Structure formats: structure tokens, C-alpha cells
């Protein structure tokens, strides 16, 4: 059982140097793939959380050498294997380190099919390009943004909001709802806009509205005070929980403290396609107001599948009259008219 007795010092006394030298002559492609092994052991030791010292020290626990640990018989006094013998350092080789990693129960290996590659190339363009580079085909985010997408990438992204920095100015109105609290029943996100509840001109309104609205709330209070069920209402009269926060009545008494003689459309919509053509998106750049060039009831009509600007002319139109006169359309409802009767 090596996975526990060796993993206790794994978190507290576990700091390792990786040797970079090579004893014997080597090839350049082989040099690259031994660099890849060095990084592979690096991230196989990194995943477990073991600290690593790039600077060789005397407080180093393990060194792993592409050097021959074995045949150590003749070496320089300054060579790191000599000082590993010298300070009880746990000397390993890369094959021995691979054996240890296999005994760690950690994966050595951390598109398979040509048909899958061709399917991937049917979308996403081809693959003859740098895998990690700004594709110039996909709009990348650099400013404050909100982006909700499908991880399966099977559906189009639902939310793509991208605001320029100057749009983030004027904190009175953001393009997104920053939480605001508000007062007097306001929608929290909505502020008191052009509304100063501290203005007495406003105050003589809310307290007075509360005076006429007083006893409706008193009746409701007395009716919902003791029992949640209202069938046991009839039974000292009113009880209240004491408070100290100032009020509309307290505010108005304060304003007499401070000012009075003293100092201080239809509901439906057409079914539109999701994919926008490139030409239609290009036309969006050329838009100008109708000041250049060239009955409130308006909305969609699920019967005729046409949008109207006027109800009194849609109902008298040809298609709507034809639909209404055709009793085959109103068939399932015809079951109900006489099913109840």
C-alpha cells in the first residue's frame, strides 16, 4: 500500500528538483520529446500538488535524472548526483520515475476517426491553421459582457451582450440591471428617478394618502391579526410591535419640526427564423432615421398569421372573414358548446 503511507509526506515535506542535463549525446527531435517527458512528469507531480524547486538546494527531497543514477562510481564532487549521495537525497531515473507514476494509480496519458475529423471540418472550417490563435471568424470578448451559451454547442448562444466602456459610464442608466433598492414599493431595479421622497412637496402627498388609506389597513389588520384562517375572527382590539424607525407620520412631524415657522402590443408575435443572412446583417449598418426619405390597436393575429396596424380593419379584411365563416376551423370548440349543454 504505497498510496497512503507515501502520500502523507506528499503534502508537507515534498519538494523535488528536475534535472536538465544529459550525459550522452542525443538527437534534436529526441531532445524535444525528452523535454515533453520532463513537462509530463512536471504536470504529473503538479496535479498531486507537490511543490517543485527550480533552484537546486540542500532541502530538496527527490531528483529524477535522465542521467544515469547507476554507474555513479566516478563523478565530479560538484555534480548533483554526488551531492545527492552526499545529503541522503532520494535519487531516481526517468524510468524509475515512470514506474513510480504507474504505481501512483495516475494516468500516464493524463480526433481518433477520419470520419469524425471530416464531420468536424464540415463545421468550424478546416484544421490547417494554428490551434491557438484568434480565428477572426469568431467574435472575441474584450469588454464587460454577458454570454450564455450551450456547452454542447448544439444550439446557438442564448445571451450575447457586449457593452463598450463608454456605455458603462452614466451610472444613472446602465445597459444591464445593477441592483438598486428603492422605496415605497418600487421595483428594486427601478430607482426613485426624478422622485425625491424627502421632498416635502412629496411628503404632504404620501402621509396624507396614508391618512385616507389608514382605516382600510386598520380593518385588514384587525381581520388578519390573530388567526391565519379568517373563520375565527370575532372575539385588546389592536396590538402593535414597538419600533423606533422614523415614519411618514414621523417624517411629516419632522417637516413641521424643520420648515413650519422655524429654521434649519397585442400579446402575440410572428414566428421568425433564427439564422440571419450575411446580407441582412450588412444592411443593418446603413440604417438612417425616417426623417430622411420615406387606431392605436396593433399586433399579431394568430388566425390570419398577418400583423395588422388596426383591429377594426383586420376583422373586416378578406382573410379574417374567410377564416371566421369556415366552421371547419372552429371544430374542437364545437364539441364543447353542446358537450356542456
Amino acid at each position: 500500500e504505497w498510496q497512503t503511507n507515501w502520500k502523507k509526506i506528499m503534502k508537507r515535506d515534498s519538494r523535488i528538483y528536475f534535472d536538465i542535463t544529459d550525459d550522452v549525446e542525443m538527437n534534436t527531435y529526441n531532445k524535444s520529446k525528452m523535454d515533453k517527458r520532463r513537462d509530463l512528469l512536471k504536470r504529473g507531480f503538479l496535479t498531486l500538488g507537490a511543490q517543485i524547486t527550480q533552484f537546486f538546494d540542500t532541502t530538496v527531497t527527490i531528483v529524477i535524472t535522465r542521467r544515469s543514477v547507476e554507474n555513479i562510481y566516478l563523478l565530479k564532487d560538484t555534480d548533483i548526483l554526488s551531492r545527492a549521495k552526499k545529503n541522503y537525497m532520494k535519487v531516481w531515473s526517468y524510468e524509475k520515475a515512470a514506474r513510480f507514476l504507474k504505481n501512483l494509480d495516475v494516468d500516464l496519458d493524463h480526433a481518433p476517426t477520419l470520419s469524425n475529423l471530416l464531420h468536424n471540418e464540415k463545421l468550424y472550417g478546416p484544421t490547417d491553421r494554428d490551434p491557438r490563435t484568434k480565428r477572426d471568424d469568431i467574435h472575441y470578448f474584450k469588454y464587460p459582457h454577458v454570454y450564455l451559451y450551450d456547452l454542447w454547442q448544439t444550439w446557438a448562444p442564448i445571451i450575447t451582450l457586449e457593452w463598450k466602456p463608454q456605455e458603462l459610464t452614466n451610472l444613472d442608466e446602465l445597459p444591464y440591471p445593477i441592483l438598486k433598492i428603492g422605496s415605497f414599493g418600487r421595483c428594486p431595479f427601478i430607482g426613485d428617478r426624478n422622485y425625491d421622497e424627502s421632498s416635502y412637496k412629496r411628503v404632504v402627498k404620501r402621509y396624507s394618502r396614508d391618512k385616507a388609506n389608514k382605516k382600510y389597513a386598520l380593518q385588514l389588520r384587525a381581520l388578519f391579526q390573530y388567526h391565519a384562517d379568517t373563520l375565527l375572527n370575532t372575539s385588546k382590539n389592536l396590538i402593535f410591535i414597538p419600533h423606533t424607525c422614523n415614519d411618514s407620520t414621523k417624517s411629516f412631524k419632522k417637516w413641521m419640526q424643520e420648515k413650519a415657522k422655524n429654521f434649519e402590443g397585442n400579446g402575440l408575435g410572428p414566428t421568425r427564423a433564427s439564422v440571419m443572412s450575411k446580407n441582412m446583417k450588412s444592411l443593418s449598418r446603413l440604417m438612417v432615421d425616417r426623417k430622411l426619405g420615406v387606431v392605436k390597436n396593433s399586433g399579431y393575429c394568430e388566425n390570419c398569421r398577418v400583423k395588422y396596424e388596426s383591429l377594426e380593419q383586420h376583422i373586416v379584411s378578406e382573410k379574417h372573414l374567410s377564416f371566421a365563416e369556415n366552421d371547419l376551423n372552429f371544430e374542437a370548440i364545437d364539441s364543447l358548446i353542446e358537450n356542456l349543454r
Partner: protein
């Protein structure tokens, strides 16, 4: 072939040390081996003197590494001899080596110096 070791570095296939050091097969070997020398060398007490020098360099934003000649001569005699021989091609490879060594401890240091 295209990659050498410290032992094979002594045998020079060129007429003079300048052509030897300029040769890429020798240049990469020298660069790797100086990278090793900066990392491994430690004092008799245990202090990695180049370790502390890199930290001081990073903590002071300096661009000077105070590399000693005892440590190079004792650790890698052939490279100290090469430095004393052709100090123009050397101190050009090793300045890069020192930059790499100080970037490992102090990442994103090229933006400063």
C-alpha cells in the same frame, strides 16, 4: 552529432574557439549547460548563491547578475576557460541563460527589463 555533453565540449573541431562557440551544435550545448550551472550550484553551507542572487535581482528590478568565477571554474572548468578565451560569444549566450533563469523564478520579467 547535433547535441554535445560537457565531456565532449573540450574537443574542438574548429580552428579557434570563436568558431567553436559560434557553432550552433556547441551554442545550444553551452546554453543548456550554463542553465544547469545557474540552477544547481550551491554553497558549502547549503545556500544556492545564484538562487539568492536571482531573488535579489527580482526584488530590486536590477538587470545585473553578479556571477562569480570561482563557482564557474570549480563547477565547470571548461566553460570558465571558454569564457576567459572568447568573452564576446560567451556573455551573450549566458546573458540569455540568466534571463531564462530569472524568468523561471520571476515570470513576466521581460516587460520590465
Amino acid at each position: 552529432r547535433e547535441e554535445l555533453t560537457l565531456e565532449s565540449l573540450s574537443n574542438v573541431k574548429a580552428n579557434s574557439y570563436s568558431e567553436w562557440i559560434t557553432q550552433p551544435n556547441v551554442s545550444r550545448t553551452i546554453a543548456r549547460e550554463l542553465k544547469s550551472f545557474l540552477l544547481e550550484y550551491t554553497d558549502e553551507t547549503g545556500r544556492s548563491v545564484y538562487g539568492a542572487r536571482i531573488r535579489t535581482l527580482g526584488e530590486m528590478n536590477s538587470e545585473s547578475l553578479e556571477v562569480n568565477y570561482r563557482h564557474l571554474a570549480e563547477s565547470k572548468a571548461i566553460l570558465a576557460l571558454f569564457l576567459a578565451k572568447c568573452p564576446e560569444e560567451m556573455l551573450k549566450i549566458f546573458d540569455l541563460v540568466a534571463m531564462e533563469a530569472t524568468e523561471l523564478h520571476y515570470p513576466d520579467y521581460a516587460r520590465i527589463h
